[PDB]
Amino acid sequence: PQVYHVDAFTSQPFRGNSAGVVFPADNLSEAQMQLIARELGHSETAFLLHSDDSDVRIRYFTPTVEVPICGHATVAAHYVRAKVLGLGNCTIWQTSLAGKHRVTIEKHNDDYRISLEQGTPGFEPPLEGETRAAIINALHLTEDDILPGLPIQVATTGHSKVMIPLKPEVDIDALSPDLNALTAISKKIGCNGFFPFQIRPGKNETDGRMFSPAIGIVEDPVTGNANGPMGAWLVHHNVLPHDGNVLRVKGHQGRALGRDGMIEVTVTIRDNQPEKVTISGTAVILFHAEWAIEL
Amino acid sequence: PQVYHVDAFTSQPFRGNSAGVVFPADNLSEAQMQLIARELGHSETAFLLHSDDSDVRIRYFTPTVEVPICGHATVAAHYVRAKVLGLGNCTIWQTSLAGKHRVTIEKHNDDYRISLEQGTPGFEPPLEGETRAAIINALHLTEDDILPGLPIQVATTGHSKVMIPLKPEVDIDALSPDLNALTAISKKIGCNGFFPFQIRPGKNETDGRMFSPAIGIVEDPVTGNANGPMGAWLVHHNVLPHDGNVLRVKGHQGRALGRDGMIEVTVTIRDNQPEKVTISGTAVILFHAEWAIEL
């Protein structure tokens, strides 16, 4: 029984999004898992369990509550598991609270990249009138800062987020929103995260920040559930040119926090609509240890 | 270069006040120590360094800033150091930004107790009028709940706290303070922490809670710089009987957080006043490891 401290969506130590990984977590109760996640203090800790109906079952806990699948924690978990079991190029099936998920492992020069297929892409009607203006004013921007001819709009591949497309000229790192205003807007529109992003001039690459004060996370460093839908939204609205039937976007997040990370978003396209979204990233293990106490 | 994860002021895993301990830290810069402290996410991480004017130097970092000294981190550090070096019953001097402090290490039953001698006890003029009323109201109490004829006041042995003496009848675990009100009080009085405490009937034994929302810590599990001054306060205001040489109080803190800890406070007495305050506790190492990355 070991604990691993992992920075996900980065190969640079102390960057990315940190997660704990514990295994084997078989015969740990729900309450012991919750206690260990509280103790480690990461946004999430993944606990790896044996499964007879899948390759592996993962349970995910914040310091206070069990959650369903989490992108960065899932990357961390499979990165650890690949490294410990010495996997090569493999497809793995994992179970969680949220059912079954397809995970891919790619090995290149003794390092690993983990891919996760997300749920079905979807969009809600664009936010207009007072709700739009209130979101823009919560970021202390004006309508001139928004990418022309594109909506502020809830997008999802499983956990919904508000897309806020910004012009390249906007200083996204200087953004300091009204957190209480965003929290109020989240209850009305029923969406707990806001995702302002911009596109690097000329490239299929982006820079975003994810603010979710309603749920108690002021800002998450690197968010698969924002970057995935963003890639889907980019196809849906024909914002980026693509050859073939795939859009590949390199999403950057976490720079203002001093926790830069990179998610590769691959979107398969059917009749110019997003069909499937896959997110990819690597990780770095800072340290790992056997527990010095009986659990 | 190793990292230890320690719960201080307890022998029970997952209780007490957790701290990180890193050593040797001699080839780390200030920036690296700060990043490590941020990464571990403990309220404090202690870094153990060679000293040229004492037995050991310690630097203390929260996730955001360097601090002069802290009790639970000091206990963690010397506990780890005692385990790693196989020390016996030793009295040593440590150096920090707070200066030179005397640390005692005691070995009983293959385990260790660490004592730290704090600074000189100090007591400011009692808080009265609107300020006293504001503090009581922010705890959702009334004047009937405060230990009769005793002041609410800033007291200190190194880092000041507001002493709030409650009747033993008050349900201290049920307190849920107006944190915005405490934050505004802290700014007016120039003190960031509030320490409601009560005395167990017939015993030299206390229960307390330390709230410090002004600095982004809603509640601290076990605070040496609150329990120390509390011990001194009890002598200064003639609250508990004693022989006249020493008063020993067993302080408890952290129960409502599910992070129960204990801190022994020893106060030497001269002319019916507190002269010298020592705090003591044990600790438990949850795990430790060499860093897997180059620092």
The residues that bridge with A99 in the sheet, in sequence order, are A96
Q: Hey, what's the torsion of the CAs at B81, B84, B90, B94, to 10 degrees?
A: -20
Residue with tokens 């823009």: A136
On whether both A229 and A145 belong to a single domain, the answer is yes
Single-letter code of the amino acid located at B125 = P
**Residue of A39, A286, A291 lying closest to B293 (CB–CB):** A286
Pairing between β-strand B161-165 and β-strand B194-199 as defined by DSSP bridges? parallel
The answer to whether A44 is a known catalytic residue is: yes
Look at A41 and B41 and tell me if their CB atoms are within 8 Å.
yes
Domains contained in chain B, number:
2
Same-domain status, B124 and B230: yes
Cα–Cα distance measured from residue B217 to residue B219, given in angstroms and rounded to the nearest whole number: 6
* Whether A87 and A105 share a structural domain: yes
Whole-Å CA distances, A40 to A169, A237, B46, B61, B129: 39, 41, 17, 17, 43
Tokens standing for A59? 């349970």
Domain residue limits at A209? 120-282
CA atoms within a 13 Å half-sphere pointing along the CA-CB vector of B28: 23
Residues A126 and A272 in one domain: yes
The C-alpha atoms of residue A18 and residue A254 are separated, in whole angstroms, by 12
Comparing CA positions, the residue from A201, A215, A216 lying closest to residue A170 is A201
Q: How far is B258 from chain A (nearest CA, A)?
A: 10
- One domain for residues A24 and A99: yes
CB contact under 8 A, A286 and B39: yes
Closest-CA residue to A136 (of A181, A76, A74): A181
Which H, E and C letters describe B178-201, residue by residue? CHHHHHHHHHHHCCCCEEEEEECC
Strands B153-156 and B122-123: antiparallel
B141 and B112 within one domain: no
Hunting for tokens 């944190």 — which residue is that?
B179
Interfacial residues of A (vs B; Cβ cutoff 8 Å): 3, 5, 7, 13-14, 18, 35-36, 38-39, 41-42, 284-293
Nearest chain A residue to B284 by CA distance is A293
Give the technique used to solve this structure: X-ray
Q: Classify burial at B241, counting beta carbons within 10 Å of its beta carbon; exposed 0-12, middle 13-18, buried 19 or more.
A: exposed
| Buried/exposed A181-206: b ≥16 CB within 10 Å, e otherwise | ebbebbeebebbbbbbbbbeeeebeb
Q: Which residues from A are below 8 Å from B292, CB to CB?
A: 285-288
Structure-token match 């410990």, residue found: A84
- Select which of B30, B39, B44, B143 is catalytic: B44
CA torsion angle A212 A216 A218 A219 (round to 10): -60
Q: Least CB-CB distance to A293: which of B40, B42, B286?
A: B286
Is A13 close to B38, i.e. CB distance below 8 A? no
In 10 A of CB A24, how many CB atoms? 12
CA distance B239 to B262: 21
List CB contacts (< 8 A) between A7 and chain B: 39
Report the alpha-carbon angle B58-B63-B69, nearest 5.
Answer: 30
* CA terminus-to-terminus distance, chain B: 8
Q: Are residues B212 and B188 in the same domain?
A: yes
Across the strands, what pairs with B253? B208, B261
Residue A150 burial (CB count, 10 A): 17
CB A195 within 8 A of CB A209: yes
What's the CATH code of the domain at B75? 3.10.310.10
Same domain membership, residue B169 and residue B28: no
HEC per residue, B246-271? EEEEEEEECHHHCCCEEEEEEEEEEC
Distance CA A81, CA A92 (A): 11
Q: Are residues A101 and A214 in the same domain?
A: no
In chain A, residues with a C-beta closer than 8 Å to the C-beta of B284 are: 293
Q: Label the pairing between strands B246-253 and B261-270.
A: antiparallel
Estimate to the nearest angstrom the gap between the alpha carbon of B38 and the chain centroid. Answer: 21
How is residue B134 written in tokens?
């504001």
d(CA A173, CA A16): 16
Q: What whole-number distance in Å separates Cα of residue B295 and Cα of residue B291?
A: 8
User: Do B158 and B146 reside in the same domain of the chain?
Assistant: yes
- DSSP annotation string for A171-211: -GGG----HHHHHHHHHHHT---EEEEEE-TTSSEEEE-EE
Mutate to test the interface with A, among B4, B14, B28, B288 (most CBs of A within 10 A): B14
The CA-CA-CA angle for residues B96, B98, B102, to 5°, reads 70
Q: Extract the tokens encoding B99.
A: 């200066």
Q: Do B287 and A286 touch (CB under 8 A)?
A: no
Distance, in Å, from the CA atom of A40 to the CA atom of A58, rounded to the nearest integer, reads: 17
- Decide if A249 contacts A268 (C-beta within 8 A): no
Q: Are residues A275 and A129 in the same domain?
A: yes
Which residues of B are less than 8 Å from A34 in CB distance?
none
Question: Would you say the C-alpha torsion A210, A211, A214, A218 has a positive or negative sign?
Answer: positive
A199 and A166 part of one domain: yes
> What's the CA gap between A223 and A212, in Å, rounded?
11
Based on C-alpha coordinates, what's the Rg of chain B? 19
